[PDB]
Design a protein around this ligand. Structure first.
Ligand SMILES: *[C@@H]1O[C@H](CO)[C@@H](O[C@@H]2O[C@H](CO)[C@@H](O[C@@H]3O[C@H](CO[C@H]4O[C@H](CO)[C@@H](O)[C@H](O)[C@@H]4O)[C@@H](O)[C@H](O[C@H]4O[C@H](CO)[C@@H](O)[C@H](O)[C@@H]4O[C@H]4O[C@H](CO)[C@@H](O)[C@H](O)[C@@H]4O)[C@@H]3O)[C@H](O)[C@H]2NC(C)=O)[C@H](O)[C@H]1NC(C)=O
Ligand SMILES: *[C@@H]1O[C@H](CO)[C@@H](O[C@@H]2O[C@H](CO)[C@@H](O[C@@H]3O[C@H](CO)[C@@H](O)[C@H](O)[C@@H]3O)[C@H](O)[C@H]2NC(C)=O)[C@H](O)[C@H]1NC(C)=O
Ligand SMILES: *[C@@H]1O[C@H](CO)[C@@H](O[C@@H]2O[C@H](CO)[C@@H](O[C@@H]3O[C@H](CO)[C@@H](O)[C@H](O)[C@@H]3O)[C@H](O)[C@H]2NC(C)=O)[C@H](O)[C@H]1NC(C)=O
Ligand SMILES: *[C@@H]1O[C@H](CO)[C@@H](O[C@@H]2O[C@H](CO)[C@@H](O)[C@H](O)[C@H]2NC(C)=O)[C@H](O)[C@H]1NC(C)=O
Ligand SMILES: *[C@@H]1O[C@H](CO)[C@@H](O[C@@H]2O[C@H](CO)[C@@H](O)[C@H](O)[C@H]2NC(C)=O)[C@H](O)[C@H]1NC(C)=O
Ligand SMILES: *[C@@H]1O[C@H](CO)[C@@H](O[C@@H]2O[C@H](CO)[C@@H](O)[C@H](O)[C@H]2NC(C)=O)[C@H](O)[C@H]1NC(C)=O
Ligand SMILES: *[C@@H]1O[C@H](CO)[C@@H](O[C@@H]2O[C@H](CO)[C@@H](O)[C@H](O)[C@H]2NC(C)=O)[C@H](O)[C@H]1NC(C)=O
Ligand SMILES: *[C@@H]1O[C@H](CO)[C@@H](O[C@@H]2O[C@H](CO)[C@@H](O)[C@H](O)[C@H]2NC(C)=O)[C@H](O)[C@H]1NC(C)=O
Ligand SMILES: *[C@@H]1O[C@H](CO)[C@@H](O[C@@H]2O[C@H](CO)[C@@H](O)[C@H](O)[C@H]2NC(C)=O)[C@H](O)[C@H]1NC(C)=O
Ligand SMILES: *[C@@H]1O[C@H](CO)[C@@H](O[C@@H]2O[C@H](CO)[C@@H](O)[C@H](O)[C@H]2NC(C)=O)[C@H](O)[C@H]1NC(C)=O
Ligand SMILES: *[C@@H]1O[C@H](CO)[C@@H](O[C@@H]2O[C@H](CO)[C@@H](O)[C@H](O)[C@H]2NC(C)=O)[C@H](O)[C@H]1NC(C)=O
Ligand SMILES: *[C@@H]1O[C@H](CO)[C@@H](O[C@@H]2O[C@H](CO)[C@@H](O)[C@H](O)[C@H]2NC(C)=O)[C@H](O)[C@H]1NC(C)=O
Ligand SMILES: *[C@@H]1O[C@H](CO)[C@@H](O[C@@H]2O[C@H](CO)[C@@H](O)[C@H](O)[C@H]2NC(C)=O)[C@H](O)[C@H]1NC(C)=O
Ligand SMILES: *[C@@H]1O[C@H](CO)[C@@H](O[C@@H]2O[C@H](CO)[C@@H](O)[C@H](O)[C@H]2NC(C)=O)[C@H](O)[C@H]1NC(C)=O
Ligand SMILES: *[C@@H]1O[C@H](CO)[C@@H](O[C@@H]2O[C@H](CO)[C@@H](O)[C@H](O)[C@H]2NC(C)=O)[C@H](O)[C@H]1NC(C)=O
Ligand SMILES: *[C@@H]1O[C@H](CO)[C@@H](O[C@@H]2O[C@H](CO)[C@@H](O)[C@H](O)[C@H]2NC(C)=O)[C@H](O)[C@H]1NC(C)=O
Ligand SMILES: *[C@@H]1O[C@H](CO)[C@@H](O[C@@H]2O[C@H](CO)[C@@H](O)[C@H](O)[C@H]2NC(C)=O)[C@H](O)[C@H]1NC(C)=O
Ligand SMILES: *[C@@H]1O[C@H](CO)[C@@H](O[C@@H]2O[C@H](CO)[C@@H](O)[C@H](O)[C@H]2NC(C)=O)[C@H](O)[C@H]1NC(C)=O
Ligand SMILES: *[C@@H]1O[C@H](CO)[C@@H](O)[C@H](O)[C@H]1NC(C)=O
Ligand SMILES: *[C@@H]1O[C@H](CO)[C@@H](O)[C@H](O)[C@H]1NC(C)=O
Ligand SMILES: *[C@@H]1O[C@H](CO)[C@@H](O)[C@H](O)[C@H]1NC(C)=O
Ligand SMILES: *[C@@H]1O[C@H](CO)[C@@H](O)[C@H](O)[C@H]1NC(C)=O
Ligand SMILES: *[C@@H]1O[C@H](CO)[C@@H](O)[C@H](O)[C@H]1NC(C)=O
Lengths: 133, 453, 53, 43
């Protein structure tokens, strides 16, 4: 089919687009993160090892948040206005992911721990519920 | 829309500055034999016949041409390849020996007086018992008198032992492409008026750079890339006189060089399975080597350079050019390699002029050497075997490297002199439009979606 | 423990090849005496007593 | 100017050595400890 009817698609193609528009092309970047004794002996091996390690490190985080095998995952952690008080319309229609990263770069580590603890609680409660039956 | 929740996205387009290790990629056509090349493209991955480039709309990025790690990586790789190409070659330890030299006066002009010497010496044979008496022709720049037919020695005998370059290998430059690993990317600035620093409003992303030829020279950039619109002047801090200036030409300037001597090669066996290639007699007349440039073309190019230089110094300033100040032969001359031989030309007829605020050719005499010290190192030399027959080569002048003299107040006069030396400025003139970034495909944002229990 | 070599030594450089030097010992500037080390008798005795115990 | 305990512990030796040039040689001398030399069969 015509898909989403885009002018063109490619790696990092939507870097300068609004976060709403760039969210429809997540697969384009996702699939290119793995492969897309002389002087050149170890310069080829260390790079490959580093790429594999980075990919696995990224995957593990999604694993422990309960979002494994997904590109868009919804969570159970409410948003705190201290991180950003901007509307929902001026974020998804007037900003780009590059700009957004700068704004909330300070609170990234705070958000990560809550996502872990929420998943821990969910797993414990699910185990208890299944045990009841 | 107040009950907002965290949502996780994987694969967002954001990045950050980073330093990583790039790997080479040579053309497939380089595999058709031609394994005899200093740039060992045998281990270089074949390139993609159809490279892919993505245009990044609305993106503005910051570049700094003078703090690029790609330059350091390229320098180290080039040096390592050069060193590696010399390991399986003859070591000229027994050549450090007393010589008995005399002038060569046999059909020579008045300018080649005392430039060649006819030396004889005792040499080892394939058998450890006996020796042989041989002779060879040496240039006057490679021998030092020690205290008629006075006795000399090779200039390098008191610092190290030279390694003879294997005669089959060739020095011809070959294009090379640098590529980044997975999870990284290379950004390119497509602006035609970029001056090497600041924000570039037109950007695009690629996986490998275009073919870059590692040409080694000083005072003059050869066989390079040309600007699209106008002559470009780039410098780390134009107001500081301790920083070099890089000039990129708009159109090429042709230069013709030749060694008009019919040389002869001799093979001398100095050990089991080892030979030393000496220089026999010269078949014919003896004349100096030189290079040619067109006067009118050089004048036009210098005029354009002057016009573009006044923008940083005012319209009522006198601009004049003078030859190098002083130093070693590798800094005060235009060095280059032309099909095996190594030249050292006297670029004093080029930078001789003054400009007010308002057919023929130029010949540059050149010398030749056989003991080479590359990369400004000490303790490692190289011996270049002689080349048989006459030599001729043609190339384009693409840029320049200049330097300014610290003057008192504003005397309304500015003098620029050529200057090379460090070879990192050669690479910097090609990798000025590239940078390496690291991808961060993880993001969090607020939404109205909530997880189902 | 204190140790010393109470001789004022002189170094020499000899060129035995292209870019190779062998460092020899020249003359000794002064008197020639043996090298030695010092330890305190009382401290050693105490330590040996503890070890025996 | 040696004590009675350092008697015979140092030797003054001279030998022919190679030079930077493959043709000629040099005569040199150096001091060696008695623990590093072995007699082979005055001076
Ligand atoms: C900027 O860029 C320019 C152009 O790219 C460059 O000039 C070029 O330099 C190369 C390298 O020297 C030149 O290639 C050489 O050309 C000579 C002359 O042959 C020409 O003419 C014949 C007949 O018309 C053509 O077939 C040929 O293609 C050339 O056009 C050749 O003799 C050279 O071959 C010898 O050297 C090779 C490399 O060492 C060997 O692999 C080869 O086997 C040859 O060696 C053998 O034969 C020799 C002669 O018998 C013998 O002496 C050897 O021992 C061995 O047995 C080589 O192909 C090219 O022609 C130049 N281009 C132009 C237009 O002139 C500049 O050098 C460059 N600038 C800088 C600073 O690098
Ligand atoms: C290469 O090796 C040959 C042979 O070892 C060298 O020739 C020798 O050179 C020495 C130096 O002068 C000669 O000694 C002198 O001989 C003359 C004539 O007999 C004598 O009057 C002097 O008092 C002195 O003894 C030696 O005779 C000579 N040997 C031979 C066989 O000719 C030569 O110098 C070496 N170098 C070169 C570049 O050839
Ligand atoms: C270093 O090299 C020199 C020179 O090669 C050596 O000196 C030589 O030593 C030999 C060994 O005795 C001498 O031969 C003897 O000479 C005497 C006196 O002429 C003679 O009576 C003997 O019958 C015997 O032939 C030789 O002459 C001498 N050469 C010179 C120029 O002095 C020396 O031994 C080597 N070693 C050292 C530690 O110096
Ligand atoms: C052989 O060439 C030498 C030079 O290599 C001549 O000697 C002089 O050397 C000095 C020092 O470089 C120069 O300044 C002189 O110009 C040279 N020539 C003269 C005449 O002094 C030497 O004269 C030449 N001829 C002979 C027979 O040795
Ligand atoms: C360099 O010197 C050598 C001699 O050491 C010259 O070669 C000899 O030249 C004479 C004179 O014509 C001949 O009779 C000999 O047959 C040649 N060979 C030998 C082994 O002696 C050589 O010509 C000189 N080269 C130059 C350029 O002057
Ligand atoms: C290259 O252009 C940049 C601007 O794109 C110049 O950098 C600016 O220089 C002015 C003064 O000349 C400063 O006031 C700005 O703050 C600089 N901006 C940045 C981002 O650094 C730079 O000087 C130019 N260089 C040359 C050699 O012309
Ligand atoms: C570029 O070079 C100029 C000249 O060297 C620098 O300006 C000088 O700055 C020093 C401070 O270290 C002052 O003492 C001088 O008086 C200044 N000279 C002039 C002519 O202004 C300038 O700071 C350099 N640019 C940068 C970014 O360092
Ligand atoms: C350089 O010298 C060589 C050797 O003298 C020349 O090669 C010879 O040229 C003649 C031309 O008459 C041929 O007949 C020979 O067969 C060639 N090979 C030899 C003699 O081995 C060469 O032509 C000269 N190059 C010049 C003068 O440019
Ligand atoms: C470079 O320019 C010089 C002159 O500036 C050229 O030299 C001429 O060469 C021809 C052919 O050999 C002679 O007939 C002329 O007499 C030479 N001019 C003189 C001696 O003034 C030379 O040919 C040019 N080419 C190269 C490659 O240097
Ligand atoms: C450098 O050498 C080239 C040789 O390729 C010269 O180009 C030739 O110039 C003559 C002029 O007499 C023309 O007739 C030829 O058609 C040119 N050949 C080509 C292939 O274009 C060039 O002129 C020389 N330049 C200098 C400054 O000497
Ligand atoms: C480079 O070339 C220039 C010009 O040919 C040389 O300067 C000339 O040197 C000669 C002596 O060799 C003098 O007679 C001239 O008077 C000099 N020119 C002027 C304008 O005075 C210069 O020496 C050369 N560079 C070297 C040899 O390193
Ligand atoms: C470089 O420039 C100098 C200075 O103009 C030239 O040297 C001579 O300068 C005088 C006056 O100063 C003139 O009358 C002469 O005509 C100049 N020389 C010639 C040959 O005309 C010099 O010629 C220029 N070229 C160089 C140094 O290679
Ligand atoms: C030196 O400059 C000349 C002239 O710009 C270059 O010759 C051009 O090469 C391209 C690519 O092969 C051709 O499409 C053009 O037609 C050539 N120009 C002319 C006038 O024929 C040459 O490639 C440059 N590089 C060298 C000489 O090594
Ligand atoms: C060991 O000997 C050296 C060399 O004799 C002494 O160094 C010299 O000491 C004197 C003291 O009077 C200075 O004037 C010289 O400048 C020193 N350097 C020389 C002579 O090259 C050194 O002091 C001695 N160390 C001792 C005796 O402990
Ligand atoms: C170690 O102990 C010895 C004695 O056991 C010390 O030797 C004395 O050194 C001083 C200073 O030179 C002399 O005045 C004495 O005469 C020495 N004692 C003798 C000869 O019995 C020595 O100084 C101590 N220190 C070191 C580092 O060994
Ligand atoms: C070993 O040497 C040290 C020197 O650091 C001696 O320590 C000194 O001992 C003297 C006793 O005469 C004191 O006056 C100094 O204050 C000490 N110096 C320090 C830094 O503590 C030590 O006594 C020596 N030991 C032996 C066994 O000789
Ligand atoms: C020079 O020193 C040697 C010892 O290196 C003295 O020779 C004797 O060597 C034997 C074997 O090691 C020792 O047991 C003796 O104690 C040494 N001395 C004596 C007197 O026999 C030799 O005497 C010393 N003097 C000379 C002139 O050689
Ligand atoms: C070791 O022996 C050398 C000689 O082989 C001595 O050096 C020479 O000593 C004499 C006597 O004073 C001087 O005249 C010479 O000038 C010295 N040099 C040479 C090259 O002979 C050296 O002094 C001896 N060393 C010791 C520690 O006894
Ligand atoms: C939001 O963050 C601020 C500081 O960043 C904190 O004071 C406040 O308690 C937070 N509110 C939440 C997590 O509900
Ligand atoms: C955010 O929403 C409030 C209430 O609807 C509105 O007053 C304000 O202008 C909005 N700000 C934006 C869209 O930037
Ligand atoms: C992040 O914190 C730093 C201080 O740690 C501060 O300088 C910066 O402005 C903060 N960024 C934002 C977007 O608040
Ligand atoms: C060079 O060109 C300028 C104008 O472009 C002219 O005035 C001058 O006479 C020419 N010749 C020299 C040697 O500058
Ligand atoms: C060492 O110490 C012991 C007791 O600690 C004492 O009897 C003795 O006299 C001391 N001296 C020696 C040499 O043991």
């Amino acid at each position: 089919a015509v898909g989403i009817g885009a002018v063109f698609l490619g790696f990092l193609g939507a870097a300068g687009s609004t976060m709403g528009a760039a969210s429809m092309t997540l697969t384009v970047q996702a699939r290119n993160l793995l492969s897309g004794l002389t002087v050149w002996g170890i310069k080829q091996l260390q790079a490959r090892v580093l790429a594999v390690e980075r990919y696995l490190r990224d995957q593990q985080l999604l694993g422990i948040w309960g979002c494994s095998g997904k590109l868009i995952c919804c969570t159970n952690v409410p948003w705190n206005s201290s991180w950003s008080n901007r509307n929902l319309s001026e974020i998804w229609d007037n900003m780009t992911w590059l700009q957004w990263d700068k704004e909330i770069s300070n609170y990234t580590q705070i958000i990560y721990g809550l996502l872990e603890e929420s998943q821990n609680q969910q797993e414990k409660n699910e185990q208890d519920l299944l045990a009841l039956d | 829309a107040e009950n907002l929740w965290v949502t996780v996205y994987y694969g967002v387009p954001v990045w950050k500055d980073a330093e990583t290790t790039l790997f080479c990629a040579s053309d497939a056509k380089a595999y058709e034999t031609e394994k005899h090349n200093v740039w060992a493209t045998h281990a270089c991955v074949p390139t993609d016949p159809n490279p892919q480039e993505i245009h990044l709309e609305n993106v503005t990025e910051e570049f700094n041409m003078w703090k690029n790690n790609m330059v350091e990586q390229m320098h180290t790789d080039i040096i390592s390849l050069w060193d590696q190409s010399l390991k399986p070659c003859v070591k000229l330890t027994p050549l450090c020996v007393t010589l008995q030299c005399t002038n060569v006066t046999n059909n020579i002009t008045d300018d080649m007086r005392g430039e060649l010497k006819n030396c004889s010496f005792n040499m080892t044979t394939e058998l450890r018992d006996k020796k042989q008496k041989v002779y060879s022709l040496f240039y006057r720049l490679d021998v030092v008198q020690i205290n008629s037919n006075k006795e000399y020695r090779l200039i390098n005998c008191n610092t190290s032992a030279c390694t003879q370059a294997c005669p089959k290998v060739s020095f011809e430059p070959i294009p090379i492409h640098y590529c980044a690993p997975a999870g990284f990317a290379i950004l390119k600035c497509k602006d035609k008026k970029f001056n090497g620093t600041g924000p570039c409003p037109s950007v695009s992303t690629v996986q490998c750079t275009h073919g870059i030829k590692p040409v080694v020279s000083t005072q003059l950039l050869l066989n390079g890339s040309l600007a699209e619109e106008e002559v470009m002047i780039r410098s780390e801090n134009i107001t500081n006189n301790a920083k070099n200036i890089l000039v990129q030409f708009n159109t090429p300037v042709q230069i013709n060089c030749t060694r008009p001597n019919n040389n002869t090669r001799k093979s001398i066996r100095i050990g089991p399975g080892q030979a030393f290639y000496a220089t026999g007699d010269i078949i014919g007349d003896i004349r100096q080597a030189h290079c040619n440039v067109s006067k009118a073309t050089w004048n036009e190019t210098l005029g354009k350079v002057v016009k573009q230089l006044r923008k940083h110094f005012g319209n009522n300033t006198i601009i004049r050019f003078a030859n190098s100040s002083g130093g070693d032969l590798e800094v005060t001359t235009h060095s280059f390699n032309c099909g095996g031989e190594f030249f050292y030309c006297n670029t004093s007829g080029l930078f001789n002029s003054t400009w007010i605020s308002n057919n023929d050719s130029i010949t540059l005499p050149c010398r030749i050497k056989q003991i080479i010290n590359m990369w400004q190192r000490i303790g490692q030399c190289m011996y270049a075997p002689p080349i048989q027959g006459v030599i001729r080569c043609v190339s384009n002048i693409t840029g320049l490297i200049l330097t300014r003299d610290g003057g008192s107040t504003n005397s309304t006069t500015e003098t620029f002199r050529p200057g090379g030396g460090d070879m990192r400025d050669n690479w910097r003139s090609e990798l000025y439009k590239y940078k390496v970034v690291k991808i961060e495909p993880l993001g969090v944002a607020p939404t109205r979606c909530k997880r189902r229990v």
